[PDB]
Amino acid sequence: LTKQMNAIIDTVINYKDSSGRQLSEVFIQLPSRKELPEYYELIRKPVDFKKIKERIRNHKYRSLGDLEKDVMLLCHNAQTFNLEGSQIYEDSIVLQSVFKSARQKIAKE
Amino acid sequence: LTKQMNAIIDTVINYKDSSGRQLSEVFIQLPSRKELPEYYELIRKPVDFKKIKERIRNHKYRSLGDLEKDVMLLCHNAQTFNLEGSQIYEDSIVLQSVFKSARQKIAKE
Amino acid sequence: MYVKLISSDGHEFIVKREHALTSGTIKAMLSGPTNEVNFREIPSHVLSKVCMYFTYKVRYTNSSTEIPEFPIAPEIALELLMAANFLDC
Amino acid sequence: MYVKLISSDGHEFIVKREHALTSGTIKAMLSGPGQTNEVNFREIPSHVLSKVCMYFTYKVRYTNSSTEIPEFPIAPEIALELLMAANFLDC
Amino acid sequence: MYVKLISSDGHEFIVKREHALTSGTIKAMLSGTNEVNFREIPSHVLSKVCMYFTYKVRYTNSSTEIPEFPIAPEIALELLMAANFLDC
Amino acid sequence: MYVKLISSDGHEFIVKREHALTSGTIKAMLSGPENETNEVNFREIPSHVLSKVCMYFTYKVRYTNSSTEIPEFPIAPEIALELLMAANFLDC
Amino acid sequence: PVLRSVNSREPSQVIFCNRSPRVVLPVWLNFDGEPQPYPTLPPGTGRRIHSYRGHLWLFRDAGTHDGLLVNQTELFVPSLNVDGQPIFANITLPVYTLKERCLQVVRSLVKPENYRRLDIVRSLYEDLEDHPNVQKDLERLTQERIAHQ
Amino acid sequence: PVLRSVNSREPSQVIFCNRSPRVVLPVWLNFDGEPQPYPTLPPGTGRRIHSYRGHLWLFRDAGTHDGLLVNQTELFVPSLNVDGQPIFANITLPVYTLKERCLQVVRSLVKPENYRRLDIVRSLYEDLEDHPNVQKDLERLTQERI
Amino acid sequence: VLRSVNSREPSQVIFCNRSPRVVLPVWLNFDGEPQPYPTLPPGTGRRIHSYRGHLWLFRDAGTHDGLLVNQTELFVPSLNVDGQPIFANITLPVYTLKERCLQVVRSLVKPENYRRLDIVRSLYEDLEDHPNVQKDLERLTQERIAHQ
Amino acid sequence: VLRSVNSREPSQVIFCNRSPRVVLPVWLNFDGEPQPYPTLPPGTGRRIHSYRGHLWLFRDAGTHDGLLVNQTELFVPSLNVDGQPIFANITLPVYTLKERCLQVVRSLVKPENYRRLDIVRSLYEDLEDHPNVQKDLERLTQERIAHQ
Amino acid sequence: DVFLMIRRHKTTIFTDAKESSTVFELKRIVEGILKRPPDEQRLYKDDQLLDDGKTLGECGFTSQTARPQAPATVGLAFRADDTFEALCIEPFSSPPELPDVMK
Amino acid sequence: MDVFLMIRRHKTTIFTDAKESSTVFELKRIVEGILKRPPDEQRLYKDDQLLDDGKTLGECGFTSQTARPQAPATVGLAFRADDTFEALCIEPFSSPPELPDVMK
Ligand SMILES: Cc1ncsc1-c1ccc([C@H](C)NC(=O)[C@@H]2C[C@@H](O)CN2C(=O)[C@@H](c2cc(O[C@@H](C)CN3CC[C@@H](N4CCN5c6cc(-c7ccccc7O)nnc6NC[C@H]5C4)C3)no2)C(C)C)cc1
Ligand SMILES: Cc1ncsc1-c1ccc([C@H](C)NC(=O)[C@@H]2C[C@@H](O)CN2C(=O)[C@@H](c2cc(O[C@@H](C)CN3CC[C@@H](N4CCN5c6cc(-c7ccccc7O)nnc6NC[C@H]5C4)C3)no2)C(C)C)cc1
Ligand SMILES: Cc1ncsc1-c1ccc([C@H](C)NC(=O)[C@@H]2C[C@@H](O)CN2C(=O)[C@@H](c2cc(O[C@@H](C)CN3CC[C@@H](N4CCN5c6cc(-c7ccccc7O)nnc6NC[C@H]5C4)C3)no2)C(C)C)cc1
């Protein structure tokens, strides 16, 4: 399960779009509150892509549906705080679409 | 001597003027060179108020005349380089006058 | 990213997916291993207004411009309250 | 604040302190213990000290300033004495 | 306590004394009078000058956001003249 | 070569061929089949206008592909309307 | 009581500005942290009020005790006044949930004894009966602060 | 320089709310106390802006450079944020003098080259010509504090 | 599209107005909505703090007429090399004689009076079509879908 | 330490001479040897076809006096973004009154006659120390070993 | 900003709009979402023909008439192989007569 | 629209800037601040013409292009003795020595 969970989370991070740019790198680590106090006033449950790798080693996620529940939570946390048309907004829309195709290849093939 | 050196350096930092504002707030930490490259091209021996607390713990200053020599150096690293009549310039004129009254109370009373 | 909500009387409502997800019940129905969803119980004059709320909520949440009251006519109030509770909006 | 610079022949030049401080040597004479508003140059004539001020005006104005700066003109007749004065002051 | 301002054409304007005093020139003419006569100010202007007194008195020191004091083009120049002549 | 533009009042304006070609209308009238003849006549354009139309050709040719600052092409109120008319007719 | 005013002795001039369409009830939390009703602000009005630094306030629909917002948040605590400049409390509608908003409207149209005549679920009937209240909301705000501290 | 920002290193979230009918030019005084123009606020909107504690601001009609008010005063200085709450800057019309208000309207209707054509006193002509200005007003505000 | 992408890496820039006009710098935000910024008087130049990848556009603050920056329509600061500031040179383009005439007429006649000028209706329509940041942004997108 | 970088990626640049002087653009070669290029008359601008990472320097073609490009001493073109050209704005620095005077004296008196001027000995040396690209390059190296 | 409801007979699009944006640009947004090329549908403002290149502002859509929770309602037509469709205005579902409890 | 000025009376010379839009009166006030003599004891001349307190430096003739920092425009100053003003008198600056032959 840990080998499968790493294959899905690493595919979403390593995923580059059709201009060669990596979408994940800005979602990989959350900003400090000192830096951006607005995200931590507006977003309820802040989680990043390294806090998901942390919870894959600590075995907090019991199934592949619990890993998905918190990848949708940060990708949805980004969408609220950022704008509809923002570069960060539409990549959390793509990172949900690349996680839902990455889990569908590893978990059943 | 360390108890006396701390009383003098802490009085100069904690010192507020007659509007309630603390003067040392700007002098507590020197800026990075990335931030302000001019300060590090024009000032020869850059030193702040935390680099003086550092050298009070490391015992680099042998007397109360060696602690004074480097408080005059940063306050003058203002005076040579900085705008006469600027907010920081007159504070380093007052921080030399509050250090010369703080050393005169602790070292002989 | 658009999504199709279909009322009892069979009207189709195309709204942004993110706008729809503001409803926990829709979020549940959509999330996991579809872009259409059918409401057997919700008429159009209601589901139309439910969408208008999504538009409103999405737009005015976290907006510094002072927020205007989301109006509800008496004629629609009760059925909307029902729909609202079912949706978890 | 305005400072008074006084030439050999005895002309008085009232210029802003900040403009004057551009001269390191004046900075020394003013920031020193002295006994100020006035400084006296017994060896600098007016036609020179006048132009030295004009430079202060120029330097202060066209510094911390970006897209284009104009040439600071110096007529041949004054060039040598100004160079002397210029050196004796920091710039 | 009310006061009477009289325009060139001879219209009478009864306004609170305190409202009028907003004008330094009126303050001068009164203080040391209940009526004051303006030989050079027509009614359509002196009427609006009063409306300003009403406005200024009411909205000075208001926490409630203050609204623009409107001036129509047709009156603007003569009002500016009257305004300058009055200390307001 | 040069080209001759003739105003309504009958002033002659001799301008470089390339300068004139800035006008699609003129380009058409000259390149339309000696061939590419020197003269073109504007019965509805007065001199004070056609003079300024040339001045624009001078300006456009000179300052197109100038890397630093270009200066404003001035038009006095008195001439503005008739020039706008002429400009539209010429396609310049 | 985590949420309470702080005895300060430093006065803080404040401007309560009601930019909601409703009559606003300013609610000062006491030092013990007990809500204290204060005089109501009519819609679209603003007044200067004398409060103290560290004092905690809360605002609500005077008529129905619906929740409002002040400076885009739920609690207002005046900063120390600087150079006589007054602090500003901008009171506005929140984005109510569609449900809570509907309840508001139904409650405003139907007499409470008739809530039982509406062809709705019992749970909805209970929700209609459960009028909003300062204390319930204060309890919720505490549990929302036990995760941050 | 009496009227200047203070370098603080402590961020202060602020809400610039333009409740004037005009386009508002926020003007940040630097540590030297030199006006720094910032992006304009359209009438009837608000923005959350990242400033720092002790930073001194000023607001004006982006077009006419007419004087505005913030929280019923001329200068705005954000307080330390309390528990993450954003501070609020409410920008409004002042009650202009009848004269200054008239000047505003005349200036807006007549081209500056035509101020000459108005049958008014020379003093008024000079007043028309003397457009309002942040720096002149800053000098005045100093003498009002001194 | 005209994205003005979040960088978090500052890029010092020098806005130099070498047009005869008052210049309105227009920053495209992350959503790609034009944001008016403080105007540059003619012949002025200032150091401004922008970020890498941020997309800018410049225009006549009054007429909303199109200007150029470094002989093109959009300016995007490159990442600074060794702290050296990037330079944005803002200039007049060579307007067509027509467009230039429109500019002058528009500047002399009140828009409600365009109808009173003894000119062709087509010219009146051209006068009425005032230049506009948004219209021009839409055009610049179709010029990027045409390079695809 | 201080040299162009072979890149093979073209970078269009605009050399804009906003100094009152004739400007000598000086390209540092890959070996890092100064290479004189064609001079820019005062108030002129040219498109230049340089390459990414190429390092340039500008000077008074006559006196070899130091100039500035984008308010700094070195210019290195970034890769073009969307075909937009980079801009190199070349200007006078604010010379010290002394250095400026030296410039004028040096321009009026033949170097063999510096000896005839009734001036202080130190100044004789200062007049003799003519500005020089290589001296300045050596200085810039120690200023880059001091920032690392 | 202007908020719009574009309806066909059975279908309803809720979308974003700028006052400054034009009827053409709007057709292209619909093309992007409903996957039918921009030339094949014609747009109605309350059942009247809409000018292919006027700005929504000039058409009549304003802040006061096109709010997010009260979007302004504009008609859409599918013309196929030279077919002209009269505007078929399918109503939404009707609410029941006002209950005595609310009146 | 800044102007750089030398205000000179006799052997006194004040170096200062002012706006084109600023007024002859405001300039007298700056002089008051320095030489401690009010605007009603001062007359300011541009060349030989007297400048009205109410006119802007612009209207008097001073422009940015002729009042540059390194070529300041000269405003003449006269003080009042009793009921009469002194003549405008600006004592000239010292002459430089003839060019040494080496600088031909
Ligand atoms: C959308 C919209 N709409 C309408 S308005 C708007 C909007 C609003 C805001 C923003 C953006 C996001 N926000 C801002 O722009 C905010 C707001 C306003 O408050 C200024 N500010 C800024 O960002 C400036 C700023 C940042 C800063 O932080 C300091 C604490 C830290 N800084 C580094 C270190 C310190 N140093 C202070 C000594 N200084 C030195 C001087 C000297 C010296 C002095 C005299 C003589 C000789 C000398 O050598 N020496 N050493 C020094 N150390 C370093 C240097 C700087 C300042 N404070 O202000 C930014 C722009 C500067 C966007 C839109
Ligand atoms: C005088 C004069 N004259 C003529 S013009 C002029 C003038 C010109 C300019 C100014 C003023 C001072 N300057 C400007 O206006 C400049 C110019 C133009 O460039 C815009 N700009 C601005 O200031 C904007 C601006 C500022 C900013 O700074 C960020 C890069 C840095 N910020 C920290 C953190 C980062 N981001 C970090 C992830 N973060 C998010 C993370 C996540 C997330 C991550 C992981 C997992 C889950 C998650 O959800 N989600 N969301 C995030 N959203 C925020 C984001 C922030 C931002 N960038 O742009 C300002 C105006 C907006 C004055 C005069
Ligand atoms: C009018 C006016 N006014 C004021 S100024 C001015 C003006 C402006 C311009 C010019 C003229 C027209 N322009 C210039 O002078 C410009 C400007 C400045 O930038 C220098 N420069 C030049 O032209 C140099 C120059 C040209 C060049 O072109 C290469 C990039 C293109 N080359 C293809 C091949 C690739 N390299 C690829 C690896 N390659 C090597 C590979 C290997 C190797 C590889 C694999 C395995 C084993 C191996 O050994 N080994 N060695 C290699 N070395 C070669 C290298 C070639 C680059 N770049 O620079 C000229 C002067 C040198 C005039 C006036």
mmCIF file of N, CA, C and O in Angstrom, chain K residues 4 9 21 29 37-39 48 55-56 59 63 69 75 78 86-89 93-95:
data_model
loop_
_atom_site.group_PDB
_atom_site.id
_atom_site.type_symbol
_atom_site.label_atom_id
_atom_site.label_comp_id
_atom_site.label_asym_id
_atom_site.label_seq_id
_atom_site.Cartn_x
_atom_site.Cartn_y
_atom_site.Cartn_z
ATOM 1 N N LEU K 4 -24.738 36.661 -15.838
ATOM 2 C CA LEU K 4 -25.698 36.366 -16.935
ATOM 3 C C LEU K 4 -26.218 34.937 -16.830
ATOM 4 O O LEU K 4 -25.449 34.035 -16.368
ATOM 5 N N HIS K 9 -33.930 26.179 -24.817
ATOM 6 C CA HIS K 9 -35.285 25.700 -24.480
ATOM 7 C C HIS K 9 -35.256 24.973 -23.127
ATOM 8 O O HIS K 9 -36.128 25.276 -22.252
ATOM 9 N N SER K 21 -16.378 43.488 -21.911
ATOM 10 C CA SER K 21 -16.362 42.357 -22.878
ATOM 11 C C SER K 21 -17.540 42.513 -23.851
ATOM 12 O O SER K 21 -18.531 43.224 -23.517
ATOM 13 N N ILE K 29 -16.965 32.020 -25.415
ATOM 14 C CA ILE K 29 -16.959 31.352 -24.077
ATOM 15 C C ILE K 29 -17.936 30.174 -24.130
ATOM 16 O O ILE K 29 -17.542 29.075 -23.663
ATOM 17 N N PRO K 37 -19.332 25.566 -32.614
ATOM 18 C CA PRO K 37 -18.575 26.724 -33.074
ATOM 19 C C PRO K 37 -19.291 28.076 -33.081
ATOM 20 O O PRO K 37 -20.519 28.120 -33.190
ATOM 21 N N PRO K 38 -18.525 29.186 -32.934
ATOM 22 C CA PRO K 38 -19.100 30.463 -32.499
ATOM 23 C C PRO K 38 -20.186 31.058 -33.406
ATOM 24 O O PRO K 38 -20.951 31.858 -32.913
ATOM 25 N N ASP K 39 -20.188 30.695 -34.689
ATOM 26 C CA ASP K 39 -21.009 31.318 -35.746
ATOM 27 C C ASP K 39 -22.438 30.748 -35.732
ATOM 28 O O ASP K 39 -23.273 31.371 -36.444
ATOM 29 N N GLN K 48 -34.767 39.857 -28.302
ATOM 30 C CA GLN K 48 -34.501 40.840 -29.390
ATOM 31 C C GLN K 48 -33.140 40.450 -29.960
ATOM 32 O O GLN K 48 -32.382 40.073 -29.160
ATOM 33 N N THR K 55 -20.396 45.940 -26.739
ATOM 34 C CA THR K 55 -20.008 45.591 -25.341
ATOM 35 C C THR K 55 -21.268 45.396 -24.500
ATOM 36 O O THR K 55 -22.233 46.169 -24.709
ATOM 37 N N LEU K 56 -21.304 44.354 -23.651
ATOM 38 C CA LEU K 56 -22.451 44.074 -22.763
ATOM 39 C C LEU K 56 -22.942 45.353 -22.097
ATOM 40 O O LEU K 56 -24.164 45.476 -22.001
ATOM 41 N N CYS K 59 -25.176 47.059 -24.537
ATOM 42 C CA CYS K 59 -26.374 46.192 -24.726
ATOM 43 C C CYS K 59 -27.406 46.455 -23.628
ATOM 44 O O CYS K 59 -28.600 46.230 -23.901
ATOM 45 N N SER K 63 -24.165 46.707 -13.485
ATOM 46 C CA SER K 63 -24.074 46.221 -12.087
ATOM 47 C C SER K 63 -25.478 46.074 -11.482
ATOM 48 O O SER K 63 -25.708 45.124 -10.717
ATOM 49 N N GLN K 69 -26.579 36.939 -7.840
ATOM 50 C CA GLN K 69 -27.749 36.199 -7.285
ATOM 51 C C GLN K 69 -29.032 36.552 -8.044
ATOM 52 O O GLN K 69 -30.071 35.930 -7.751
ATOM 53 N N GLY K 75 -31.187 35.177 -24.178
ATOM 54 C CA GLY K 75 -31.639 34.030 -24.988
ATOM 55 C C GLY K 75 -30.537 33.527 -25.892
ATOM 56 O O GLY K 75 -29.776 34.371 -26.424
ATOM 57 N N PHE K 78 -29.916 27.850 -31.501
ATOM 58 C CA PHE K 78 -29.190 26.863 -32.340
ATOM 59 C C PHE K 78 -29.733 26.935 -33.765
ATOM 60 O O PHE K 78 -30.861 26.452 -33.972
ATOM 61 N N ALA K 86 -37.348 30.395 -34.031
ATOM 62 C CA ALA K 86 -38.039 31.393 -33.182
ATOM 63 C C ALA K 86 -37.697 31.088 -31.722
ATOM 64 O O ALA K 86 -37.505 29.880 -31.406
ATOM 65 N N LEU K 87 -37.605 32.115 -30.878
ATOM 66 C CA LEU K 87 -37.213 31.925 -29.465
ATOM 67 C C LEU K 87 -38.299 31.091 -28.795
ATOM 68 O O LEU K 87 -39.437 31.594 -28.695
ATOM 69 N N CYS K 88 -37.943 29.885 -28.372
ATOM 70 C CA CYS K 88 -38.852 29.017 -27.602
ATOM 71 C C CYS K 88 -38.556 29.269 -26.116
ATOM 72 O O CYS K 88 -37.445 28.892 -25.646
ATOM 73 N N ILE K 89 -39.452 29.964 -25.421
ATOM 74 C CA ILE K 89 -39.150 30.352 -24.013
ATOM 75 C C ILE K 89 -39.802 29.303 -23.125
ATOM 76 O O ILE K 89 -40.964 29.505 -22.735
ATOM 77 N N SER K 93 -40.070 25.805 -13.523
ATOM 78 C CA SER K 93 -41.194 25.273 -12.710
ATOM 79 C C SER K 93 -41.888 26.388 -11.909
ATOM 80 O O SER K 93 -41.201 27.253 -11.345
ATOM 81 N N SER K 94 -43.222 26.374 -11.834
ATOM 82 C CA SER K 94 -43.984 27.429 -11.110
ATOM 83 C C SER K 94 -44.017 27.092 -9.623
ATOM 84 O O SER K 94 -44.057 25.920 -9.243
ATOM 85 N N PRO K 95 -44.023 28.106 -8.728
ATOM 86 C CA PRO K 95 -44.254 27.881 -7.305
ATOM 87 C C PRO K 95 -45.748 27.799 -7.006
ATOM 88 O O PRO K 95 -46.556 28.419 -7.694
#
